[PDB]
Design a protein around this nucleic acid. Structure first.
Ligand SMILES: NCCC[C@H](N)CC(=O)NCCC[C@H](N)CC(=O)NCCC[C@H](N)CC(=O)N[C@@H]1[C@H](O)[C@@H](OC(N)=O)[C@@H](CO)O[C@H]1NC1=N[C@@H]2C(=O)NC[C@@H](O)[C@H]2N1
Lengths: 104, 52, 117, 63, 88
RNA sequence: AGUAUGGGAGAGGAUGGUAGAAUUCCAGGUGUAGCGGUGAAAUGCGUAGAGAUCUGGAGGAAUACCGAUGGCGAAGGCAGCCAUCUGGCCUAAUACUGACGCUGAGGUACGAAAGCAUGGGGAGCAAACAGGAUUAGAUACCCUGGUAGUCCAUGCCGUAAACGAUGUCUACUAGCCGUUGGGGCCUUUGAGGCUUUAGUGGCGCAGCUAACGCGAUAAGUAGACCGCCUGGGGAGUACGGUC
């Protein structure tokens, strides 16, 4: 399979829901196949510039390993979910597990 | 470089937010390319501003 | 009638004319004067002296609204920006900040053709 | 820029700190470049001449 | 695309000796597998000429190796073209 | 000459998605006589409210800074970010095939911009065109507008100062100074110094050249194959033929 790094920005008003969505995403990944090598919650960070007239957001960082169908499903879920205002997906070589900076 | 390394990224950014050329900071070309890519990814991620 | 204490000064300087607009914060206009209004018709619009005169007129008009400290923003090239900002201070205002806000595209639309003069 | 001004700073001195800020920023150069469209051929020739001048300056300052 | 395991299976099948990776049989089999694999790519990316140049290079190399093998040993040439399905 | 295995750099190509700045238009708040343009003006816009300034919408096209005598590609060419499919190149040591090579008449593939066909799109720019200027005249250069086009999909066209005005491949012939991607060695804690290789530049001995200049990226010394030239016009024209 392939290793991906995913960054999610969540509307602060819906921060109470973040746990449910991350559990269901991890559950989907696991039932299909693959691993989760990092899960980090940076918290409620202020944005450098407003997005959709919002000034703060919840930041989630995932380092996972999964397949193409799982990647497509995750992209579709991020697109169609409204709690997610921005997402970044980056291919990686080798799995990163060490606690990143910006964790605090 | 990595885009989460925000303080190090700010070390190479002017007060307008523009990227500093390699000639001024003495950077290597390979390191500079990675630094610029990290800056652009951070700008998209909204950890650092695009302008100002 | 309305009283404001803090204000913003917008300077629109070009190679052809200078426009000085005094607004309150939140961008609502209070007074405005241009080099065209104070004579200086045609080519005479662009000289620094005309910009100074227009800035003085605009500051005097805003003094009736009665604000004492203002923040100036300069947008555009051409003569008259420095003269205009000096005139605003010379009227008796306290300038709080002064910055350039001229728009710069990130390689957007195509400019017009080069003049062959 | 955002040139904020101190208690003892005169108006003229504040404006002077300002033109230094803006001259260091070099926004007016971009404004000059933006006003008319430059063909890619002319841009390439300009950059070629600039590179030659830079190398000549480097040689002159080294020796 | 093909993987190391897929390439190793072809090399093992067509090898003429121990650690034989340079024989015309092995080279032609590898090129044939790669060419057949790329036909799927060029069905969905018809206007990708830059990669089609490399595909044409593979075809030319296969032709040259086949002609060399035919010159060296006719029986091996017929056996290889029969095993790979090539018409010539 | 080629193959397998580890590692590396890249605006190489195709598809889809997405982010920020700016221009234009629309609606609204403040507000009042100009705005715009030039050498100077005028055409033009504005008291049914312009320009300026602030907030919110619509849409198209292009990617500031990084940026470089930098990089990649056979050439034409390729620059925001992300994913998918995919070509070539560089680099180390083994193992393998055993001349499998070079060039190439015909042929065939790709091939800037403009142009053509069918269907979409259209912010900005702008052939044609309209008006205002300048002028002896202005058909132009300047100004205010503006259609095709420039953009997308699917095809055609096959031409450029398509240039290094320098066909491809191979070997050899002083040195000095840069830069890009790798390999090795040495100092000694982390940054420097020697080499080697593949690119990309500046000088320059010998040699060559009518001269200018070229000079290991040759226009030097030699070999293999192909293309082309034979005074200037008439003329890349006429007739015939192919597309
Ligand atoms: N192995 C494959 C590698 C491929 C790659 N290509 C590397 C390569 O193989 N290179 C070979 C070098 C040949 C070179 N092209 C010939 C040349 O250089 N001039 C042509 C001869 C004309 C004349 N006899 C000399 C001349 O007038 N010189 C001028 C002059 O010095 C100076 O002009 C002024 N006004 O003072 C300078 C500033 O512009 O310009 C030069 N002119 C130019 N400088 C440019 C340049 O180097 N190139 C491109 C083009 O632009 C060139 N014209």
């Amino acid at each position: 399979m392939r290793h991906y790094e995913i960054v999610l920005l969540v509307h602060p008003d819906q921060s109470d829901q973040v746990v449910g969505m991350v559990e269901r995403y991890i559950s989907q990944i696991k039932e299909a196949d693959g691993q989760i090598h990092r899960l980090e919650d940076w918290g409620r960070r202020q944005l450098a510039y407003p997005i959709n007239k919002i000034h703060k957001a919840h930041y989630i960082l995932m380092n996972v390993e999964c397949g193409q169908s799982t990647l497509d499903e995750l992209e579709e879920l991020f697109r169609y979910n409204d709690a997610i205002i921005r997402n970044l997906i980056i291919r990686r070589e080798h799995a990163i597990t060490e606690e990143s900076l910006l964790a605090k | 470089i990595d885009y989460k390394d925000i303080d190090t990224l700010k070390q190479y950014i002017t007060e307008n937010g523009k990227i500093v050329p390699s000639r001024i900071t003495g950077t290597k070309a390979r390191y500079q390319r990675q630094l610029a890519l990290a800056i652009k990814q951070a700008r998209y991620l909204s950890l650092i501003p695009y302008t100002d | 009638t309305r009283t404001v204490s803090e204000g913003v000064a917008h300077i629109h300087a070009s190679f052809n004319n200078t426009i000085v607009t005094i607004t309150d914060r939140q961008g609502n206009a209070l007074a405005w004067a241009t080099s065209g209004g104070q004579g200086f018709r045609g080519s005479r619009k662009s000289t620094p002296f005309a910009a100074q005169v227009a800035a003085e007129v605009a500051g005097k008009a805003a003094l009736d609204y009665g604000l004492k400290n203002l923040d100036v923003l300069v947008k555009g090239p051409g003569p008259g920006r420095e003269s205009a900002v000096r005139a605003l201070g010379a009227v008796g205002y306290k300038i709080n900040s002064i910055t350039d806000v001229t728009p710069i595209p990130h390689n957007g639309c195509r400019p017009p053709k080069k003049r062959r003069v | 820029p955002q040139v904020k001004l101190k208690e003892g700073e005169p108006v003229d001195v504040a404006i002077r700190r300002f033109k230094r800020s803006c001259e260091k920023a070099g926004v007016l150069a971009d404004v000059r470049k933006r006003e008319f469209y430059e063909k890619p051929t002319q841009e390439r020739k300009r950059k070629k001449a600039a590179a030659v001048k830079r190398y000549q300056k480097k040689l002159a300052r080294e020796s | 695309a093909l993987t190391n395991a897929d390439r190793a299976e072809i090399i093992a099948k067509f090898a003429r000796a121990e650690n034989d990776t340079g024989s015309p049989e092995v080279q032609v089999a590898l090129l044939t597998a790669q060419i057949n694999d790329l036909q799927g790519h060029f069905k969905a990316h018809k206007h990708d000429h830059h990669s089609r140049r490399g595909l044409i290079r593979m075809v030319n190399q296969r032709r040259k190796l086949l002609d060399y093998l035919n010159g060296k040993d006719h029986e091996r040439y017929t056996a290889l073209i029969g095993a790979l399905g090539l018409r010539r």
